[PDB]
Paper text:
AMPA glutamate receptors (AMPARs) are ion channel tetramers that mediate the majority of fast excitatory synaptic transmission.
We next determined cryo-EM structures of the GluA2–TARPγ2 receptor under two different pH conditions in an apo state (in the absence of l-glutamate). As already apparent in the two-dimensional (2D) class averages, the signal encompassing the NTD tier was diffuse at low pH but was well defined throughout the receptor at pH 8.0. At pH 8.0, the BD chains were spaced apart by ~55 Å (center of mass (COM) distance) throughout the classes, while the BD distances ranged widely at pH 5.5; some NTD dimers adopted an upright conformation with a ruptured BD interface (class 31), while either one or both dimers bent toward the LBD tier in other classes (classes 19, 23 and 37), resulting in a range of COM distances between the BD chains (70–93 Å). The two-fold symmetric BD NTD interface is stapled together by cation–π interactions between R172 and F231 on either end that are unique to GluA2 and is stabilized in its center by van der Waals contacts and H-bonds, including those between the H208 side chain and the I203 main chain.
Numbering used by the authors:
A (entry chain C), B (entry chain D), C (entry chain B), D (entry chain A): 10 to 383
Write the structure that this text describes.
């Protein structure tokens, strides 16, 4: 009744760690407690990721929570699938079916295509970033080929910031050659903030221009900066701030202090932090299910090292995976239900549009049902 | 005075190993000799790749030669950068800059864009495969954005060996429906062979079609099947069989036997194995230059541990990298010279066409000079 | 009882011999058994054919089964007519009336002419091989002279196999220069396979061309390579694979231990082998009927030599011939009925084309009724 | 000393036999006198032909002379090739190379094609019979395909004489309405005589009709019937009546009597008879050369039975073949010389076109040069 888990967090991650500890203290069952081993590192460094994973495996950790990017996803997936260690992450889902990886970030390709069809778009620009994967870009290109679209895929992830002014000015001047008024911003948070800021400077945020933020976090950024101007702005939001549970959680979250809980005294929580909260919840739920199933998973610092030749797995790993992937709970992100691969199934995505008054949801998207209008 | 190096090879790259051994015996001794440690492994498995790298590092190898895949390149780059151990490879160049990696494959984006400009194409399909990366697809996407092209990018990678015929057939009927005669194949040898077989079966290799084989191995595939069809078949070739060095090497190499040297009894040699030969030459020349400079590189003791904390790299790694990047030799691929990032500069790619009498070179593409017609 | 027969199988006809053995072991009963003398020989050698015929006559056989070509048909027919010994064959029917020769192959000239009239052709080519024969070419030339057609007869039997690629390529180039779109392939299985391979290689199987495989073995050749090209490919088939008897035959034929029965472990049976099986059936039926007629068919070793001077035949062979020509049974080729001259009558030939979903029987041809469309 | 030879003659070749005996008595030398054993049989009967051949072979005969038909050429050539026995014939050349056979009849396809080219023919009818093979038919069809001729080939051998009136009228009316004014008669002497008799009866010999008789016996048939008909008639001839040797032979032939020399009391002889005479001459010359070369091909005992398994070859037969294939003597049919295969070369064919004063040689044809006009 003393489960030791592992935690990998980026060097500079505060809100996600705060949500992690909030969930841990919220779901601290009197039957058992989860003791985490938190490692802060540069996730982009595959060597550092491997070092942390190997140290946690040597320490005897049953389940590992962490993050990965395009430069550190393959190593994590391979190590987990070989050593039979369950990995729970809020990061982007891997392209394919990688075992022993629990992916709680819902896919956005289907919702993005459904929203594009709803908006009746034929020609548009697609500004993407290579720091998260090109699966969305490939899906957009395939849909464009199928439905006879004219998509201009432009990468904005390979430019610095000192020459950003001139580079993006040239990019937008080239975009105005075709009179492009509809663009999609499939970029990270800092990248999309740069896009919106430089759009404001260049003066292309006037009416007629349509912008789509291709991420689950729409209300986290400076929506007020481009709120005025009359330009269409649309996006997605996994979290429903109007839900009773979300409001109850956010009240306590705002009442928490900032010293011991960095990035907490605010009325907006990042979707990564929300997914970390549901990750804590699902970990506790799976371990309660394992305890109630009367299954012995006794393990300690005796499994061995990381680079054992041959690397023999342990039989409890497949049972831990079955327990993790066979739960159905509800959190900030909504209904949670994974498949045999480790991806959510019956999730719901709330679509919001930005107006002068403020952000406002226009409908919801699901798997069985396409975009719905209220 | 023996120098120990490492070797990573995929399970199936027999011709590459044969070319490695041929280069080893050719450049056997001038003032010393090399001692490679070969470790055949699944190159796409990041865990196995890490295990091989760590075993070779513990063995105390001065340099490492091996391949990598799109899902195993980050591990090599990170480990080599953090351990100051060079990695000479004939695989696809990395998307960016990475120290301690000596990439031997010349870039193809510039030559492909120059060939498209020379052919004056406005609506060309792009059948890409997710093995060597999507960097060329991205580059052609920005080029299309900046040159007003109609690119129909289609992924032909995520298909199994059970509906290949149906998938390729339906793809080509779709291409006929939008009436698209210009197609670019950015796939490897086996994939382009499958595509060529399918297009022959459906009967679209007749006059009125144009295909570009976007790989350095234009003649490595079986072009005799589409030689008499009547459609343009362009491509790029890195080895010139009419060159003195290549002709002498082929005369020495075709007389061998397929028992001790698998895949070494043919008049043609794959560009990957050619780059293996030139990589053996480059390593030999670099170590010869190091010996001539009288720099002490021998270890003072054991190499250490792969996952040691902190990862301390030896002071001779920078010297090894500089010596490897400072060599300028002539090989099968042509002039060999590396810049500060480990890429290849001052190279030449011969553009060739498949006429009814055989593949005939029509010109060459350099970095300082664009496509030249001869 | 024990009745001995002869066998003139060629050197290389493994499937026909396997079908012969299967027919023997299936139609053999306790009433009597058949003892064959199988001699493998170069059937184009009239000397060897005469030697084998003389030896089998010297044994004292009652009927002879085997094959012949255009270079050995006259000697076989003359020997059988002079010696009053019957000869059942699946080879091409003789161009005339010949007694004591039972021919299991139905005529194709009438069906071919009816199909040409149905397709309403005016200017078409006719690729013939002198090795198979020229009776069909003579018939089509006479019809063209009587119906104002433009037939371009081409011989393809004189091409040596050492360089039989440029010959076909130049031939089809000449056909293109003559604007020839419709071609009739009247050749053997190997020759038609080579012609189809060359056609696909030169890209002459696309929509706009028409091909008629003028032989009863439409599906025996590898038709899948040209199925998806898009050009019309018609032909004739004598064996109906959807019939109950044929399906029951294949149910056993596909599981016949190919090592023990060469050319049997397949779902496709050559029309020649099917005719051999039906010939075994008809000879067994004829001998059973002769035994059930209370006729003395006792013959001892009094045959002597085949070149007796004068050559006095044995009168017991005319009853054998009458019984053989008085057989009305069903089989793989369909209804079997022989006229006074031994040529097959009351037969149906299935006319099929090659579609994307496989060959389909669109109708049947008969002597009494012209081509019928379904 | 003497050499036994064999003679195969059809039932009715009385003048052929008379010419053979005239040649024998004229070329009888005191050094050795041959003793031919003449056999009379239906040459179309393959069984009789091979029985006579085997009787000769058992007799111990070194060289065989005789005729063969379309239905016996194959067996004759096969037996001669297998038993290494030389065969000398005046019949049609074999449709292809065949060892141990001497063809004394010069080819006609080249001369006929040259005459057609010189006569500026682009549309005609090729009336042929299947008696001398289809080599000429194949040659004219290939030449028509090459030179864009609209030739209509009609077979007349299969049509029964009783019913060959209504069909004759129908086909001639078809030719008249289609302006098929030019015809070619590649038929035997009797068939062409019947054809010209029918033409005279029907009155289709009006000005414009250009009949070509494709045989060497132009003057053999009745040409005075169409001498004053006003219709062009062109033929070929191998024996020149103006030569001194031919004139002396025809005088010594006409001075003979019809009692002991049937059909020898006229001034008109057949080209086949002339070829028989030249065959006797070449046989005598070859035997004289063999005797002079001090080569004894004498056999101690009987050759045995032809049906012996295995066969019984002998190198003296090969030496005899080499002796025959290296003879260059003149004769009634002109110069005689054989190539390596056995065909006759170094020959000239005299072309005559019928006029009101009778046949007159309008030129000659050879192989070292095209057709020549005098
Ligand atoms: C392959 O087979 C198809 C059969 O579906 C051929 O289609 C044929 O196309 C011709 C076009 O000239 C049709 O002839 C036309 O018939 C109509 C109605 O009788 C008439 O009004 C036109 O003037 C013309 O004569 C023909 O009917 C049609 N076949 C059938 C069965 O309907 C196609 O041509 C074939 N491919 C080749 C290369 O021959
Ligand atoms: C029958 O024999 C007579 C006797 O020569 C032929 O008369 C002449 O034949 C020549 C060719 O042998 C003809 O020359 C041709 O003339 C045409 C123009 O009409 C020209 O285009 C050709 O290139 C060629 O030079 C010639 O006209 C013809 N008549 C005369 C008066 O000289 C005759 O052609 C033969 N055939 C028939 C069916 O009569
Ligand atoms: C921005 O949003 C507005 C309203 O939400 C859109 O306005 C209408 O959109 C419908 C949907 O296709 C069109 O049929 C109408 O013609 C639009 N009317 C007007 C006055 O715009 C608008 O299309 C959206 N996009 C842009 C670029 O403005
Ligand atoms: C295949 O090659 C031929 C000839 O190299 C191309 O034909 C040329 O097409 C261009 C179109 O840009 C015309 O301007 C030229 O006149 C054509 N002929 C020549 C000799 O250049 C053809 O376009 C190529 N592609 C295909 C699909 O056929
Ligand atoms: C032809 O064969 C069929 C099937 O065996 C039979 O029904 C039909 O009566 C036969 N025709 C004649 C004329 O006997």
């Amino acid at each position: 009744n003393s489960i030791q888990i592992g935690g990998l967090f980026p060097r500079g991650a505060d809100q996600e760690y705060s949500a992690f500890r909030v969930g841990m203290v919220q779901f601290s069952t009197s039957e058992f407690r989860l003791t985490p081993h938190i490692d802060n590192l540069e996730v982009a460094n595959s060597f550092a990721v491997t070092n942390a994973f190997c140290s946690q495996f040597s320490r005897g950790v049953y389940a590992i929570f962490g993050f990965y990017d395009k430069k550190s996803v393959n190593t994590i997936t391979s190590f987990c699938g070989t050593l039979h260690v369950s990995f729970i992450t809020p990061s982007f889902p891997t392209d394919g079916t990688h075992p022993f990886v629990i992916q709680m970030r819902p896919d956005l390709k289907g919702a993005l295509l459904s929203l594009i069809e709803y908006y009746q778009w034929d020609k548009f620009a697609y500004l993407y970033d290579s720091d998260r994967g090109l699966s969305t870009l490939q899906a957009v290109l395939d849909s464009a080929a199928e439905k006879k679209w004219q998509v201009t895929a432009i990468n904005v992830g390979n430019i610095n910031n000192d020459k950003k002014d001139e580079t993006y000015r040239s990019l937008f001047q080239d975009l105005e050659l075709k009179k492009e008024r509809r663009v999609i911003l499939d970029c990270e948070r800092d990248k999309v903030n740069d896009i919106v800021d430089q759009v404001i400077t260049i003066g292309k945020h006037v009416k007629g221009y349509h912008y789509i933020i291709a991420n689950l976090g729409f209300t986290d950024g400076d929506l007020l900066k481009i709120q005025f101007g009359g330009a269409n702005v649309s996006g997605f939001q996994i979290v429903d701030y109007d839900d009773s549970l979300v409001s109850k959680f956010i009240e306590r979250w705002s009442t928490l202090e900032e010293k011991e809980y960095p990035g907490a005294h605010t009325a907006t929580i990042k979707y990564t932090s929300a997914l970390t909260y549901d990750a804590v919840q699902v970990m506790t739920e799976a371990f309660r299910n394992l305890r109630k199933q009367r299954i012995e998973i006794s393990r300690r610092g005796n499994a061995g090292d990381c680079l054992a030749n041959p690397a023999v797995p342990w039989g409890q790993g497949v049972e831990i995976e079955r327990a993790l992937k066979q739960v159905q709970v509800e959190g900030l992100s909504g209904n949670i239900k994974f498949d045999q691969n480790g991806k959510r199934i019956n999730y719901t995505i709330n679509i919001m549009e930005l107006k002068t008054n403020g952000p406002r949801k226009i409908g919801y998207w699901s798997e069985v049902d396409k975009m719905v209008v209220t």
